[PDB]
Amino acid sequence: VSCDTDFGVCAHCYGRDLARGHIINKGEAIGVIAAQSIGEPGTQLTMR
Amino acid sequence: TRYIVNEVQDVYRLQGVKINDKHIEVIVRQMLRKATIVNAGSSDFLEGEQVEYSRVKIANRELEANGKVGATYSRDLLGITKASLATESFISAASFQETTRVLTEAAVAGKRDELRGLKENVIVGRLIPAGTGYAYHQDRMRRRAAG
Amino acid sequence: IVNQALGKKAISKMLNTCYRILGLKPTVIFADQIMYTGFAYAARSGASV
Amino acid sequence: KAAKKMVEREEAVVWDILDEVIREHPVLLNRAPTLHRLGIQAFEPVLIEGKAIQLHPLVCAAYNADFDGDQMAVHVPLTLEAQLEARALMMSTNNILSPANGEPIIVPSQDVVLGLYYMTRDCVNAKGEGMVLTGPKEAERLYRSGL
Amino acid sequence: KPLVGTGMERAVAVDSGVTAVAKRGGVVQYVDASRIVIKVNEDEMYPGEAGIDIYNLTKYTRSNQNTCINQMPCVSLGEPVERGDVLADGPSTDLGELAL
Amino acid sequence: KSDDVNGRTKMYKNIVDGNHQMEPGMPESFNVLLKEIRSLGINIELED
Amino acid sequence: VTEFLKPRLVDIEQVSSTHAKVTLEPLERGFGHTLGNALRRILLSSMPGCAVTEVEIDGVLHEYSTKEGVQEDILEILLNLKGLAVRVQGKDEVILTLNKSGIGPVTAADITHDGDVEIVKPQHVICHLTDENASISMRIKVQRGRGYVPASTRIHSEEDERPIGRLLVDACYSPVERIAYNVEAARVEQRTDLDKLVIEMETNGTIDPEEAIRRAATILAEQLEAFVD
Amino acid sequence: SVTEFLKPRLVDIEQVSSTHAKVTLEPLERGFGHTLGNALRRILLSSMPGCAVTEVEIDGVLHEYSTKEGVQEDILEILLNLKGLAVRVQGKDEVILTLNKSGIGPVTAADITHDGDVEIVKPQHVICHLTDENASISMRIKVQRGRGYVPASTRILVDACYSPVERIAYNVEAARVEQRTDLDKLVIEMETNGTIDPEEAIRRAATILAEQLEAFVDLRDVR
Amino acid sequence: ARVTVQDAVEKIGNRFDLVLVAARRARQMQVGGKDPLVPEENDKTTVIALREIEEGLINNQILDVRERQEQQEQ
Amino acid sequence: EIKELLKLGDLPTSGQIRLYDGRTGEQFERPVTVGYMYMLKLNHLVDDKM
Numbered sequence A: 001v002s003c004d005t006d007f008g009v010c011a012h013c014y015g016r017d018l019a020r021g022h023i024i025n026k027g028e029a030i031g032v033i034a035a036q037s038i039g040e041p042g043t044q045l046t047m048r
Numbered sequence B: 001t002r003y004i005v006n007e008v009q010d011v012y013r014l015q016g017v018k019i020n021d022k023h024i025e026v027i028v029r030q031m032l033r034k035a036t037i038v039n040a041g042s043s044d045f046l047e048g049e050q051v052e053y054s055r056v057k058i059a060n061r062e063l064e065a066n067g068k069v070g071a072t073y074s075r076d077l078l079g080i081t082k083a084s085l086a087t088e089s090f091i092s093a094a095s096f097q098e099t100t101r102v103l104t105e106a107a108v109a110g111k112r113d114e115l116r117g118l119k120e121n122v123i124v125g126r127l128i129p130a131g132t133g134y135a136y137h138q139d140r141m142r143r144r145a146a147g
Numbered sequence C: 001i002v003n004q005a006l007g008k009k010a011i012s013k014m015l016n017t018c019y020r021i022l023g024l025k026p027t028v029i030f031a032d033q034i035m036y037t038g039f040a041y042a043a044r045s046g047a048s049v
Numbered sequence D: 001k002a003a004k005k006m007v008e009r010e011e012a013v014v015w016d017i018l019d020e021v022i023r024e025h026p027v028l029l030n031r032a033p034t035l036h037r038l039g040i041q042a043f044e045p046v047l048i049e050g051k052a053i054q055l056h057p058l059v060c061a062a063y064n065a066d067f068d069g070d071q072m073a074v075h076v077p078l079t080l081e082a083q084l085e086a087r088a089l090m091m092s093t094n095n096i097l098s099p100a101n102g103e104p105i106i107v108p109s110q111d112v113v114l115g116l117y118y119m120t121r122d123c124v125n126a127k128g129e130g131m132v133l134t135g136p137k138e139a140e141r142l143y144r145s146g147l
Numbered sequence E: 001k002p003l004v005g006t007g008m009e010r011a012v013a014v015d016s017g018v019t020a021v022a023k024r025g026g027v028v029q030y031v032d033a034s035r036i037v038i039k040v041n042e043d044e045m046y047p048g049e050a051g052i053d054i055y056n057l058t059k060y061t062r063s064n065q066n067t068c069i070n071q072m073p074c075v076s077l078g079e080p081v082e083r084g085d086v087l088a089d090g091p092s093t094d095l096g097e098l099a100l
Numbered sequence F: 001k002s003d004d005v006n007g008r009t010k011m012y013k014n015i016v017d018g019n020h021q022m023e024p025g026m027p028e029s030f031n032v033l034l035k036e037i038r039s040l041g042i043n044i045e046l047e048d
Numbered sequence G: 001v002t003e004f005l006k007p008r009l010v011d012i013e014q015v016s017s018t019h020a021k022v023t024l025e026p027l028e029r030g031f032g033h034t035l036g037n038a039l040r041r042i043l044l045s046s047m048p049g050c051a052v053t054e055v056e057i058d059g060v061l062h063e064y065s066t067k068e069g070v071q072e073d074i075l076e077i078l079l080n081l082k083g084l085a086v087r088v089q090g091k092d093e094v095i096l097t098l099n100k101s102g103i104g105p106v107t108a109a110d111i112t113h114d115g116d117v118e119i120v121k122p123q124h125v126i127c128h129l130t131d132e133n134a135s136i137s138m139r140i141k142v143q144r145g146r147g148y149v150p151a152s153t154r155i156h157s158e159e160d161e162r163p164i165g166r167l168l169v170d171a172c173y174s175p176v177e178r179i180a181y182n183v184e185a186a187r188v189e190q191r192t193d194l195d196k197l198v199i200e201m202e203t204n205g206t207i208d209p210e211e212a213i214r215r216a217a218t219i220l221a222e223q224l225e226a227f228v229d
Numbered sequence H: 001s002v003t004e005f006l007k008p009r010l011v012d013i014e015q016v017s018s019t020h021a022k023v024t025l026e027p028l029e030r031g032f033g034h035t036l037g038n039a040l041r042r043i044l045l046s047s048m049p050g051c052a053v054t055e056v057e058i059d060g061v062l063h064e065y066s067t068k069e070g071v072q073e074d075i076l077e078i079l080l081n082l083k084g085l086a087v088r089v090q091g092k093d094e095v096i097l098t099l100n101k102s103g104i105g106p107v108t109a110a111d112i113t114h115d116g117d118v119e120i121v122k123p124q125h126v127i128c129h130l131t132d133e134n135a136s137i138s139m140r141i142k143v144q145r146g147r148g149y150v151p152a153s154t155r156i157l158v159d160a161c162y163s164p165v166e167r168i169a170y171n172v173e174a175a176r177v178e179q180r181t182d183l184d185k186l187v188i189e190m191e192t193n194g195t196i197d198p199e200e201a202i203r204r205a206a207t208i209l210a211e212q213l214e215a216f217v218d219l220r221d222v223r
Numbered sequence I: 001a002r003v004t005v006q007d008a009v010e011k012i013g014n015r016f017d018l019v020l021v022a023a024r025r026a027r028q029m030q031v032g033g034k035d036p037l038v039p040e041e042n043d044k045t046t047v048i049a050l051r052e053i054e055e056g057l058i059n060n061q062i063l064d065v066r067e068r069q070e071q072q073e074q
Numbered sequence J: 001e002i003k004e005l006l007k008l009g010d011l012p013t014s015g016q017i018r019l020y021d022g023r024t025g026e027q028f029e030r031p032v033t034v035g036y037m038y039m040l041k042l043n044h045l046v047d048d049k050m
Helices: B002-015 B022-031 B051-062 B100-109 B118-124 B131-146 C008-021 C024-045 D002-009 D012-022 D080-089 D111-119 D137-144 E008-015 F005-016 F028-038 G032-045 G074-082 G209-225 H032-046 H075-083 H198-217 I007-012 I017-031 I045-055 I062-073 J002-008
Strands: D027-031 D040-043 D072-075 E027-031 E035-039 E052-056 G009-013 G019-024 G049-057 G086-088 G094-101 G117-119 G135-145 G166-168 G178-184 G196-202 H013-015 H020-024 H049-056 H087-089 H095-097 H118-120 H141-147 H167-175 H183-191
Touching (some): B002 B022, B118 F028, B131 I017, C008 C024, C008 D111, C024 D111, D002 D012, D080 I017, D080 I045, D137 H032, D137 H167, G019 G209, G032 G196, G032 G209, G049 G074, G049 G086, G086 G135, G196 G209, G209 H032, H020 H198, H032 H167, H032 H183, H032 H198, H049 H075, H087 H141, H183 H198, I007 I017, I007 I045, I017 I062
Antiparallel strands (some): D027 D040, D027 D072, E027 E035, G009 G019, G049 G135, G094 G135, G178 G196, H013 H020, H095 H141, H167 H183
16 A cells, blocks of 8 residues: 555565565566465354 | 454454465455545546546646646445446456346446456457466557547 | 484484585485485384294 | 287287386376366376375375376377476476465375474483484484484 | 174164164075065964965165175074074174174 | 366367367356346346 | 305295295395395286186076076185186186086086196085076186186176176186295304205195295396396 | 296396496396396395405504504595405405505505505505605505405404395396286496406306306206 | 476576566477577476576577578578 | 284284295395285276266
């Protein structure tokens, strides 16, 4: 949100967080990369 | 953002799950859109404009021609089940929760999609503007300027 | 690194060192050969119950 | 029609042509219940006289299988570009680390760690405690006798 | 047959009605792979009947799960048979025992 | 491999000739969607 | 080479008709275990044997039914015929017939005996009949082979032949089915201590111990001759 | 068919160095590849005639806790370096060797006295580390004739490295001849200490086993 | 076959244009009219093209140059 | 009770028994507990799944 682009997110504020060793390149869909890792560990608890 | 990320990482850490906070910030950013305005600002005397469109409009109107006409906005967050429906393309955000109301609203307003969401390219069945097809999508956008 | 009780975290950090220091293919072939050793020695060890 | 009949008759030359063509044609595998990016990965196919695909023990953690009753989805990309996309991005050799936190998904465990932890041990002192050697001779005397 | 069991498998086998049991029989005359005749003794015989009972087995009969139910007889020839005892062995049954 | 009727034949020919070239065209299910939408009181069409 | 002192075959023992023990002369260190391993695995893997490939009978058509007068099904007929043990002379592909009537038990003894065929266990059970009027009439062919084969393998060899009524079974082609070895230090004197190995095995009587051991050694030498050059 | 067994014809061998070689075979019969590999490995490790150094009598204290006295290197690693020497003896029996050099420091295998049948594979081998001054030392080493491998704990002083080998290993792979894929492919990998070609070594092992097992057949396959 | 594709990645860097370059090379290689600049080892066109881009002898630039070369040579 | 039964059939009470390799014939350390289990076959068969 800090990055001011009005469209998507620039690579200059995200780092890598991937199995590579370089900054994220253009065209990579972070949103698809996101939103899926969060709920993947579906081993939470119910009924408190 | 800080409160949300702290609260969610507490829950993911009490169990043992280790996850970066950047995805959570992405969730917040997708969640934090659709600012509401109180001043007209010569933009529109209505409510429910996108934050990005408002920022682009104020950048193109203030610095260029008239900087005195300021449009004050209040950035109001919306829940996922509601913010997802807030899309400029009728095709997208349709199969998510409900279709008939979205179709009625699009036909009433007469909106056009431009096929900008990924689901649009999926349903039509072309290269999505991501990964390998990003360069092709960019070239198509570039050639669309001239004709 | 190879002189320890060599638990699961030991082998984990060993692969981490091999990846960050050497690279992709060295650590991939390293893990391959490690797992082959694991099958061989477990089958040789016995480890009855 | 000649090709169809001979393929249906399953001659040795047909097997030879299969082997020649499949030898350079990678193939993609998927878990039916999938949650993250690693539930789908590509591999080099190898012919084995059986009827159950041989999956490597390491990628079992990513595919989250357990060698109980399960069904895998297999897919073939046909265009040259799709083979290339599989080779460059969806191979296991490239996908060593997690896209979630950064920790390696490949976490060896079970028999491998048990055996390694076993052979890096010493009761008090086994046969031939005081021997000295260069390092390759250790296995030479371990396989046969002496220690 | 199972080496280590609990004993209730015998009751399950004799109660599922899958095998063939003998009712009011005293001794067997003829044995076939698909047909068994028992000669009831006069003790358990009432007047007005021939004094024999026939049991036709189940040979390779299609089951609901597309499996096979085949009954295999137990006695050989001229064996004294009491009441309430098994004669054939149905699917996964051995000597009147659930052997699966 | 989808409902593109004019694509499956052409990909088969490209394979047997060893061409390995693909032209997307348009899935037929999208036309199905358009036809069923036009079944109700809603216009829908694709511009140029 | 320093006086390797190759061992020799001595003291062949016969524990029983289907069980025997073999003794070998002492040999140098580090040899007994590997030679025992090789001989055991070769003897259990590749060694010619004679078994039943298919049985045809005029009475019944297929193997999933019964016959009038018999107690056990055609399945037990085929399985027990799988368990029969016989040896054959030089020529292979030998067909023998079995015809009998009555209510008495049927064994391997009451079969038409020809000069090239000899039974080792005449007390086998061929699923005795129960009816006086019942009479079985089947003819069997026995061939020789080396390794285990299923029924599906020999299907392509028969396309126009094999009419109805001819039933095929599986062959073992393995007449020993069990062998073990043990090495000890004995039979050595006036020299550095040597080791001797004893081989304990059980066959079905089709093949003699010395013959099988010699065949294993011969094929071992043949397969290792390629590594000479 | 009845008694016919396939024989390996693809015996291609690719080598990286004169002491390292990779041996690959064609698909062999079922279950025999690993038998043969284990047998050849055990033959190569358990008994292989060769010449090696048996023990040394250095000038000083026979105890292991000796002094540097200008050598500045403990005798233990000196003996270890001595074990890494491939001495070749042509026809003679156990013989005594000795060396003497000035105080330049590089102690090589050429420092030993040259005998009629005493040969060294590569004279650049290190025997002692660089010395500190012009002080010399007498080795008084000797070699013996033997086969296989025995330690010096039981049979005396450093070791007995009679096997002219460094490392031995093997693998078995599946392959197909025409249709059936249930075939065994044997791959042999072995590193040589020296003085013996790897293919020569494996040929010697095969001949050794053949002449260890020939009378088991009682003169079979006459014609 | 190749186990890891990293040299081509280093020669390209963007990770997205390398697939396009190798695909456009392989298409012309398979349709014909060109020869492999790298000695082949009985392998398909895609592997040869990827080894060529890994060796540092072909990229997205010299393809345009050579293509304009035959286009003007007609 | 089980250990008492094992002695009657000439079996070790611990249930551990030395094993050899059928591939290299080297005696296994860590004596193994071998046994006889009642296995069952299920209709979940690969001959239907392919």
